[PDB]
Amino acid sequence: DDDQVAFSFILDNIVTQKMMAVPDSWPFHHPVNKKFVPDYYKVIVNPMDLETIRKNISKHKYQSRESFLDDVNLILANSVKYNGPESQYTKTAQEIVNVCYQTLTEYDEHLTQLEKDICTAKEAALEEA
Numbered sequence: 541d542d543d544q545v546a547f548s549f550i551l552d553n554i555v556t557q558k559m560m561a562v563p564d565s566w567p568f569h570h571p572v573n574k575k576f577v578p579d580y581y582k583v584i585v586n587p588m589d590l591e592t593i594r595k596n597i598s599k600h601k602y603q604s605r606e607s608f609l610d611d612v613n614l615i616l617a618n619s620v621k622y623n624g625p626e627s628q629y630t631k632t633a634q635e636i637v638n639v640c641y642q643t644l645t646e647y648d649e650h651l652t653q654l655e656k657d658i659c660t661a662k663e664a665a666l667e668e669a
């Protein structure tokens with residue numbers, strides 16, 4: 541299971557060191573509390589936040605960049621929907637998304653390596669089954 545452990549480790553470091561460090565990103569750190577935003581869950585059908593991404597990483601939900609990026613992109617998509625394309629929340633979520641893509645890009649070689657090797661371990665597991 542250890543290429544998956546290393547992979548999750550890296551994703552988690554992206555979330556804490558890059559995405560959470562975006563200025564004024566605090567609104568995206570945790571699930572919305574309906575007390576503070578009364579309509580959020582009536583408008584937003586698939587909520588997402590950085591704490592949920594971190595909890596998903598620690599459970600090894602993400603085997604590849606694609607499923608990680610799907611949740612990351614969801615944060616920006618919910619913000620366009622709820623706040624509008626030019627809201628300050630959306631600009632902050634766009635920086636969160638943009639710095640995530642950039643970091644994945646800078647780690648592209650090692651991350652392709654890990655992704656391929658998580659798969660090859662998945663297959664060895666099947667050639668047991």
Ligand SMILES: C/C=C/Cn1cc(-c2cccc(C(=O)N(C)C)c2)c2cc[nH]c2c1=O
Pocket residue numbers: 566567568569570571572573574576577587588589618619622623629
């Ligand atoms: C899951 C993240 C969603 C991002 N988001 C958060 C808040 C917001 C504002 C103030 C407090 C909270 C909140 O519930 N906290 C900090 C727990 C969320 C907000 C207010 C208007 N639009 C938004 C918004 O798009």
